[PDB]
Structure formats: structure tokens, C-alpha cells
Amino acid sequence: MKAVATSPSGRFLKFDIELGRGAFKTVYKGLDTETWVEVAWCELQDTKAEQQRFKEEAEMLKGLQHPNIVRFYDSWESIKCIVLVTELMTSGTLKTYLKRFKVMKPKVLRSWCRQILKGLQFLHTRTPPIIHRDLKCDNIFITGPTGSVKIGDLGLATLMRTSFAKSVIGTPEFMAPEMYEEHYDESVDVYAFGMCMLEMATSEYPYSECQNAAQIYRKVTSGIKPASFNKVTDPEVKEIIEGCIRQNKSERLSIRDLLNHAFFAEDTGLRVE
């Protein structure tokens, strides 16, 4: 198996083995010549100010270390495309887990949600803060051993140097209504986490009844909840989801409110008043 590309630092190789393909990202099999452990050689679809901004953001993502965040090895612009090297995750995501077991056990849902919340609190407390802008169950990877989860797919993330981000990107099912207004903050990762928790409690894509991305845009910007919202059996999970997907960003719960919620700590014994 001869390698077909090499990272600029000379550390990572690319193999012509496609593992997955999405709307803008193709996952190849890569190798870390320092350790000979395989990595993920991901290739994404690509002014000078944005190019210089890109070099600084990659250097900060390159320095992140947190047990609930996939390691960001390197990234650069190639020849028309953006290469992104991260950990080759091989235990499946929370989407493949939901697509397999259909029902997620309540204790499993809370344990993984708390780790996701700790992963989001890490990005939001960086200097400058980092918005994921693409949180969903397929960007949350199960890690061995002990089955801890890490947030990955930082290809759409931004460092918050100003007060607000503007670019309208992400996955429509998980995008906050103010994202289409080109003026939003880190509250969109809470909104997407509300849809992640909705996906884990219903085991389907939110707004699956919509025909395309425009219908999702029309419903969300009108303050209409997805049809799977009223299918949530656990009232505690339903109220938390409602507290995250609120149409007004200023009314939504915060990460600290979620991390301190009495729901994510009920696995200490019986449910008592």
C-alpha cells in the first residue's frame, strides 16, 4: 500500500482508501509516521485575509486537548481543497448507534450528553471562544475504551474574535434560526445540542417530515418545532429540548444551566421529589 500524499510537516501520509463521503468532506485513511497509528485524512471543499485567518485558526485547533474533543492534528489548503487530519474514529457515531439500537437507554443518554456538554463548555471557554457550528449525533464519536464520546468534525468551526459570526453554513436540521440572519453567537451550539438530545430521544433526524432544506428553513425561522418533538416520552428530556431550541437565543438555557440540570444527575438512585 503505497502512500499518495504527505502533510506539509511530513508527519502524516494519505492512502487512497475512501472510508466515507458527505456533503463537503471525504474521509481517507491516513497514517501517523511518528507513531504508525492510523489517522483520518479528511479532504473538504475549500481571500488573503481569510487565508491568513485560516492559518491562525488551524494553529489554535492544533493546540486543543480535551477528553471530549477529537484531536485536531493538522489542516491546510492543498494545491483547491482543505485537508484536515484528525483521529480515525472506528466505534461509530451517536447516529450509527441510534440507527442500530433504535432506543438509547436513559442512563446512556445522560452520561453521553454530559460529556458533550463538557466538550461544548471547553470550546466556548477557549481564548478566543470556538463555535462548533456543526453539532449533531454523527459528529459525536464513541471512543474506546469505556465508551466515552468526543465531539469531532471541526471543519466548520470558527474562533470568535468579534462579537458575532455571520456565515450561513452547517446542517439545516441543526441550525439555529438566527444563523440565516447572518448574526449569531455560541448559542447555536446549544440549539444544535437540543436537536442532538432530540435525536437521541426519538432516534430520527429532526424535521424528517420536511421535503428539503428550504422547508426546514421556513419552519425554524417561523418558530415551528419539528414534528418529532411531541414524540418525546420523557417529559424531562422534552423540557430540556424546548429550553435549547427556543426561537429567541436570549431565552435559551446555557451550557452551565444544562450541566447543572437535575436531569443529568438522576443516576444516583431512585427518582424522589
Ligand X SMILES: Nc1ncnc2c1ncn2[C@@H]1O[C@H](COP(=O)(O)OP(=O)(O)NP(=O)(O)O)[C@@H](O)[C@H]1O
Annotated binding site for ATP: 86-89, 136
Q: Which three cell numbers stand for residue 16?
A: 487512497
- Whether 69 and 123 have beta carbons less than 8 Å apart is answered as yes
Residues of each annotated binding site: 86-89, 136
| Catalytic status, residue 153 | yes
How far apart are CB 152 and ligand X at their closest, in Å? 5
Residue nearest to ligand X (CB): 22
Task: Name the nearest CA neighbour of 117 among 193, 203, 200.
Answer: 193
Q: How far apart are CA 95 and CA 174, in angstroms?
A: 14
The nearest distance, CB 132 to Mg ion, in angstroms, is 11
Q: Find the catalytic residue in 74, 138, 153, 189.
A: 153
Q: How far is the CB of 207 from ligand X (least distance, A)?
A: 15
139 binds Mg ion (CB under 5 A): yes
User: Which segment (27-35, 41-49, 133-141, 189-197) binds Mg ion by CB under 5 A?
Assistant: 133-141
Residue 22 makes contact with Mg ion by CB under 5 A: yes
Q: What is the DSSP letter of 85?
A: E
How far from 48 is each of 9, 53, 54, 55, 156, CA to CA, in Å? 22, 8, 9, 11, 19
The nearer residue to ligand X, 134 or 186, going by C-beta atoms, is 134
> Which of ligand X, Mg ion, none has residue 171 at its interface (CB below 5 to 8 Å by kind)?
ligand X
Q: In the beta sheet, which residues pair with residue 41?
A: 28, 85
Name the one residue in this structure whose C-alpha cell is 487565508: 51
Q: Residue 83 Cβ, how far from ligand X at the closest point, in Å?
A: 13
Radius of gyration of the chain (CA): 19
With CA atoms as reference, report the closest residue to 95 among 63, 148, 141: 141
87 or 178: CB nearest ligand X: 87
Q: Residue 187 interacts with Mg ion (CB under 5 A)?
A: no
Name beta bridge partners: 77.
82
180 class by beta-carbon count within 10 Å (0-12 exposed, 13-18 middle, 19+ buried)? middle
Report the partner that residue 226 touches, choosing among ligand X, Mg ion, none (CB closer than 5 to 8 A by kind). Answer: none
- Binding stretches for ligand X (CB under 6 A): 19-25, 27, 40, 86, 88-89, 134, 138-139, 152-153, 171
Q: Which stretch binds Mg ion (CB under 5 A): 1-9, 45-53, 135-143, 185-193?
A: 135-143
Active site residues: 153
Binding site for Mg ion (CB under 5 A): 22, 139, 153
